Amino acid sequence: SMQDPIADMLTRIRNGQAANKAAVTMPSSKLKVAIANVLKEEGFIEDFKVEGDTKPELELTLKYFQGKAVVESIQRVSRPGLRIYKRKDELPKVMAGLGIAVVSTSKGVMTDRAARQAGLGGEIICYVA
Measure the CA–CA gap between 64 and 54, rounded to whole angstroms: 33
Residue 102: closest CA among 91, 110, 94: 110
Task: Give, as one character, the DSSP assignment of residue 64.
Answer: B
- Shortest CB 29 distance to RNA, Å: 4
- Shortest CB 97 distance to RNA, Å: 18
29 binds RNA (CB under 7 A): yes
Binder of RNA out of 22, 68, 85, 95 (CB under 7 A): 85
φ/ψ region of 75 (left if φ > 0, alpha if ψ in -120 to 50, else beta) reads: beta
Angle at 129 between CA 87 and CA 117, to 5 degrees: 35
Q: Site residues for RNA, window 86-125 (CB under 7 A)?
A: 86-89, 104-109, 119-123
Q: For residues 36 and 109, which CB has a smaller minimum distance to RNA in the complex?
A: 109
CA-based diameter of the chain, in Å?
43
Q: For residues 19 and 95, which CB has a smaller minimum distance to RNA in the complex?
A: 19
Instruction: Point out which residues bind RNA (CB under 7 A).
Output: 1-5, 7-8, 10-12, 14-16, 18-19, 21, 27, 29-31, 34, 54-56, 75-76, 79-83, 85-89, 104-109, 119-123
